[PDB]
Write an enzyme that holds these catalytic residues in place. Structure first.
Site, PDB file in Angstrom:
ATOM      1  N   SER A 271       1.059  -1.865   0.112  1.00  0.00           N
ATOM      2  CA  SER A 271      -0.354   0.004  -0.029  1.00  0.00           C
ATOM      3  C   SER A 271       0.989   1.409   0.006  1.00  0.00           C
ATOM      4  O   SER A 271       2.052   1.631  -0.428  1.00  0.00           O
ATOM      5  CB  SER A 271      -0.907  -0.014   0.866  1.00  0.00           C
ATOM      6  OG  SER A 271      -1.792   0.920   1.327  1.00  0.00           O
TER       7      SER A 271
ATOM      8  N   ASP B 190      -8.018  -3.890  -7.079  1.00  0.00           N
ATOM      9  CA  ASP B 190      -8.105  -3.625  -5.894  1.00  0.00           C
ATOM     10  C   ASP B 190      -7.345  -2.472  -6.731  1.00  0.00           C
ATOM     11  O   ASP B 190      -7.210  -2.035  -7.586  1.00  0.00           O
ATOM     12  CB  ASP B 190      -5.959  -3.756  -5.319  1.00  0.00           C
ATOM     13  CG  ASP B 190      -5.549  -3.287  -4.454  1.00  0.00           C
ATOM     14  OD1 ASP B 190      -6.160  -1.887  -3.740  1.00  0.00           O
ATOM     15  OD2 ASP B 190      -4.731  -3.861  -4.021  1.00  0.00           O
TER      16      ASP B 190
ATOM     17  N   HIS C  37      -7.246  -5.810  -1.935  1.00  0.00           N
ATOM     18  CA  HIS C  37      -6.375  -5.370  -1.221  1.00  0.00           C
ATOM     19  C   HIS C  37      -5.978  -5.939  -0.114  1.00  0.00           C
ATOM     20  O   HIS C  37      -4.504  -5.301   0.720  1.00  0.00           O
ATOM     21  CB  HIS C  37      -6.918  -3.447  -0.678  1.00  0.00           C
ATOM     22  CG  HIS C  37      -5.511  -2.611  -0.318  1.00  0.00           C
ATOM     23  ND1 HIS C  37      -4.498  -2.015  -1.166  1.00  0.00           N
ATOM     24  CD2 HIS C  37      -5.442  -2.034   0.911  1.00  0.00           C
ATOM     25  CE1 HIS C  37      -4.128  -1.713  -0.802  1.00  0.00           C
ATOM     26  NE2 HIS C  37      -3.808  -1.254   0.440  1.00  0.00           N
TER      27      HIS C  37
END
EC number: 3.1.1.74
Length: 223
Positions: free
Chosen positions: A135, A187, A200
């Site tokens: 991320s 995602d 995700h």
């Protein structure tokens, strides 16, 4: 002691705020990760000394500690398993993993991580250094590589990015053959968005494949 990936994902499903933007989800993600960590005995902070292999890992936005619970711990366990007798040392990247830096670009964080990389290479010149990110942490790794010269990045054995918000951009000043980017279909973060959807949160499923990518790149005698 740890559950299976299937049991881990089922527990996350009870609390994770799927479909929300990262801003609206932030505190619930942090609480959910902390609850899963406490329940399963999964450490969210790593500060090991260098091993035969050393991973510098930058966590995701709102993840607790310095590695979070969703991806990092699973990747470290898979990598240690794949390394057999060789030791793995893991060091989390001490940055805020804030919502604002995710929305801005996490750039001073990139400079700080570039300094941490330089410091680990000097402190442990014989370790095989691997960079990992999830991320926003993947933005931090991208920004660290942008702030380092090709000669310094050449000292990195491999880069593994999960749920890369910069998906499509290569790791700067580095051989793309030594990079693995894992971005799940669906995602929203990999599309440059800010919505937290189930794809995700399931990168623990790719830990074995990410470890297998790293192993051939961490030999002391493969040039």
């Amino acid at each position: 002691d740890w559950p299976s990936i299937n049991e881990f994902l089922s527990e996350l499903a009870k609390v994770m705020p799927i479909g929300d933007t990262i801003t609206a989800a932030c505190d619930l993600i942090s609480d959910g990760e902390d609850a899963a960590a406490s329940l399963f005995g999964i450490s969210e902070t790593e500060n090991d000394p260098c091993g035969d292999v050393t991973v510098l890992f930058a966590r995701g936005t709102c993840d607790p500690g310095n590695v979070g619970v969703l991806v990092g711990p699973w990747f470290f366990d898979s990598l240690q398993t794949a390394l057999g007798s060789r030791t793995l040392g893991v060091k989390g990247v001490p940055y805020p993993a804030s919502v604002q830096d995710f929305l801005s670009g996490s750039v001073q964080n990139g400079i700080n991580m570039a300094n941490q990389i330089k410091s680990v290479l000097q402190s442990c010149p014989n370790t095989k250094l691997v960079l990992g990110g999830y991320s926003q942490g993947s933005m931090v790794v991208h920004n660290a590589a942008s702030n380092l010269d090709a000669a310094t990045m050449s000292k990195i054995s491999a880069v593994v990015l999960f749920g890369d918000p910069y998906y499509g951009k290569p790791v700067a000043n580095f051989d793309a053959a030594k990079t693995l980017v894992v971005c799940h279909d669906g995602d929203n973060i990999c599309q440059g968005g800010d919505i937290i959807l189930l794809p995700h949160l399931t990168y623990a499923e790719d830990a074995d494949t990410a470890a297998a990518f790293v192993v051939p790149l961490v030999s002391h005698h493969h040039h």
